[PDB]
Amino acid sequence: QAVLKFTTEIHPSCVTRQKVIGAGEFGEVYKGMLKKEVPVAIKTLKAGYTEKQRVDFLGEAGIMGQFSHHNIIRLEGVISKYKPMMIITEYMENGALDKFLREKDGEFSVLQLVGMLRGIAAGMKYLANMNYVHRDLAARNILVNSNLVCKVSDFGLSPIRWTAPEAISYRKFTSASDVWSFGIVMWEVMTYGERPYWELSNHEVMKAINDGFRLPTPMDCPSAIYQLMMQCWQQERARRPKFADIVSILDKLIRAPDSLKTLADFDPRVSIRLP
Ligand SMILES: Cc1ccc(C(=O)Nc2cccc(C(F)(F)F)c2)cc1Nc1nc(-c2cccnc2)nc2ccccc12
């Protein structure tokens, strides 16, 4: 019961499941309604779950209740006293950031894009400060509300090309490997959801990174933004910025917006000669 100290217990009579929107660890995820009704997403733990699954499920509910931040997905509450058990979160019409950007290519200003990154960074600074390592930070795990506010979430695995070398090589997941992932997310946002490293295979990505190659500048990208994402990709974990540094830089760039007008050179893959 203590694990749920920051959570609100919701009575099952207040919940209606409507459509399956995913598969959980041991159950389905539903779109539904919560008692004027509020649309919600509902992750269930179905009959037969193991002890480890229950510990992980209630632990997830407990940390989500603990988190209270503008840029972290909101937990409405939990059903733990009845079966099936449920984790109930807010629901976003705009959905996941990766698909959102790919469906809105070129529709936002540079300031809007950088504002999204500042929000993600603030949520990640909060998680890291709370001693929570995400391990799967990627645009597909970020929700976008109708104010363009980005909320860090974790929908479980669908991530070599988002993962820092030390996490791949020896399973060292820390806030600093999350920083590497954040740099990849910066590149996803500034490219409107391009696939990191395009068609390179997972092995080719790892070999390129080990050889010293890094993702090139997105088109029309502020110089300061590319500089920041590049420093997230330093091989040496200790040399990467902390999330506090990232938030501070992004905030200062937004608040002095002329700083974003200087653009990094873009390397064309294709030459078009015209008179
Ligand atoms: C129901 C639910 C339960 C848990 C989470 C979730 O983000 N958990 C989580 C776990 C660890 C750390 C964090 C984090 F990020 F730190 F906050 C969040 C999200 C959701 N919400 C959604 N899940 C899912 C989903 C889909 C497939 C598999 N699992 C969840 N899809 C959604 C679609 C639209 C709006 C919300 C959701």
Domain locations in the chain?
A: 1-92, 93-275
Parallel, antiparallel, or unpaired for β 85-90 and 15-23? unpaired
Task: Supply 41's token pair.
Answer: 């997403």
Q: Where are the alpha helices (DSSP H) in 92-237?
A: 97-102, 110-129, 165-170, 175-190, 202-211, 223-232
Q: How far apart are CA 98 and CA 79, in angstroms?
A: 30
CA–chain centroid gap for 13, Å, is 32
Q: How far apart are CA 264 and CA 43, in angstroms?
A: 43
Q: Domain 1-92 adopts which CATH fold?
A: Phosphorylase Kinase; domain 1 (3.30.200)
Resolution in A: 1.1
Task: Supply 102's token pair.
Answer: 């790919």
Task: Supply 117's token pair.
Answer: 């990154």
The residue written with tokens 């995820």 in the block is: 29
Q: How far apart are CA 186 and CA 97, in angstroms?
A: 12
Nearest atom of ligand 1 to the alpha carbon of 73: 17
To the question of domain 93-275 being in CATH 1.10.510.10, the answer is yes
| Partners of 193 in beta bridges | none
Helical packing angle, 223-232 and 175-190, nearest 10°: 150
How is 184-222 classified by DSSP, letter by letter? HHHHHHHTTSPPTTTT--HHHHHHHHHHT--PPPPTT-B
Task: Supply 193's token pair.
Answer: 């959801």
Give the active site residue among 136, 154, 211, 245: 136
CB of 152 closer than 6 angstroms to any ligand 1 atom: yes
Q: How far apart are CA 162 and CA 138, in angstroms?
A: 7
Q: Is 9 annotated as a binding-site member?
A: no
Task: Supply 56's token pair.
Answer: 């992980």
